[PDB]
Amino acid sequence: AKYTGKCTKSKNECKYKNDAGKDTFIKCPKFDNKKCTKDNNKCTVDTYNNAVDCD
């Protein structure tokens, strides 16, 4: 299901909310389908398989 938050076009970082309900910054990849295209987007991190998935 992955988490939900937002990515940043500044340094391609996703700030999702862990299971505790607190901020969680996580650098995203550079793929053509997992990179932070724009800021304030929708990013989903898969803490299950430790695989991030930005908008």
Domain ranges of the chain: 1-55
For residue 18, the SS3 value is coil
Burial group, residue 14, by CB count within 10 angstroms (0-12, 13-18, 19+):
buried
Residue with tokens 């989903």: 44
β-partners of residue 15 are 25
- Angle at alpha carbon of residue 29, lines to 19 and 18, rounded to 5°: 5
Distances, alpha carbon 34 to alpha carbons 19, 20, 21, in Å: 22, 25, 23
> CB count, 10 Å around CB of 51?
12
The two tokens of residue 36 are 């932070």
Between CA 34 and CA 46 the distance in angstroms is 12
- The method recorded for this entry reads NMR
> CB count, 10 Å around CB of 15?
14
Note whether 2 and 29 are within 8 A (CB): no
